[PDB]
Structures are given as C-alpha cells and as structure tokens.
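Page 47, continued from p. 46.
Same chain as before, 200 aa.
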Amino acid sequence: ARVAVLISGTGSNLQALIDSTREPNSSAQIDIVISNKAAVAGLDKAERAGIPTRVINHKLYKNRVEFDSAIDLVLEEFSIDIVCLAGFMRILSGPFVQKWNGKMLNIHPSLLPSFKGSNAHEQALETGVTVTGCTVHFVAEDVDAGQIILQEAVPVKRGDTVATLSERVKLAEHKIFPAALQLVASGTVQLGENGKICWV
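Result:
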C-alpha cells in the first residue's frame, strides 16, 4: 500500500512510521508527507528520509472543502491508498472523510472515548486519572470518534506535567501507530460493511 502522512508540526510519529515501512516484511511505503504549515520540523524529517513533501496552506482557501480538495488532488497525483494523520491539526470535511473512509488513520494521545479533542494530556491531568494512553482509529466525520484499531495504556505519574506525560504517551504511540498501519496496509484489519472493525 502507498501511504501519505499529513502533518501540522513536529511529526513526532513520522520516523516510527518510516522505519516500520522500511522493514523487510512491510505492507506499506511512505510516498509523501503533506503539511498545512511551512517550515515545520516534520518536513525536515521527511526531507532527511528522502520522501517528497508538499505544503498546502489552509489559510489560502475560503473553506474546509476547497482546502481538502487540494489535499486530495495531491493524494491522487501520488496514487495514495492510505492516509496517516501524524499531528495533523485541521478537522477534515465530510466529503473528504467519506472518500477516504476505511483508508485514513489518526493517532490520538488518550484512551478513547476518554478525552476527545486536542488537549488530551491537560484533560487527563485535570481529571486525575492514573492511567491514560493512546489510540489509533479510523478517521470518521465526528472528531476522535472513528473505529478503534489499537490502543496502549500508559501510567500517569504523580507530579506529571503535560510535557512529561506527553513524552511517555509518545513512546507508546511510536509502537501502536506503525503496528496499526501495517494491520490496515496488509489484509489484516478492515473497516467492515457494518461500519465495525473486522479482523479478516
């Protein structure tokens, strides 16, 4: 399977994905990295890895739909089968999400359905959980609500800050995100006709 990775920043999970796809028994290859912001560290990572990059500034379009159409133009250009969101920070429109249904994954730094939204660590710490984690899920229209592929629990330590908890959760993300990509890329895991996660 041919894979695109969309980023908005440092692309924390990008290298783990790259390394995974370059192992001998890989079902996936990363063919392009697309960022909605220029000069982010994730682009430098992609450039160092020898992977083509594009920058598509969301601020240059009047709505989500036109911006997403510009993304999908590039995805078609590169014959992409699978989209991975690695710290991509723009909510995608219905039509884009619909077209890429069963073919687009996201990493979220909580055990969904807890702590939906972009500040999961802050929420976890305010709530006072002693266990949090990360989730790889298919992207659905509803934000952070798509079908769960894999999860990993991560302890919260007394005295944790967003920075320390974030680092601990990132280590787990580096494990489950490439594992989930491989599961989808190969025959192994599919979004079913009933809308549920199916292990073929």
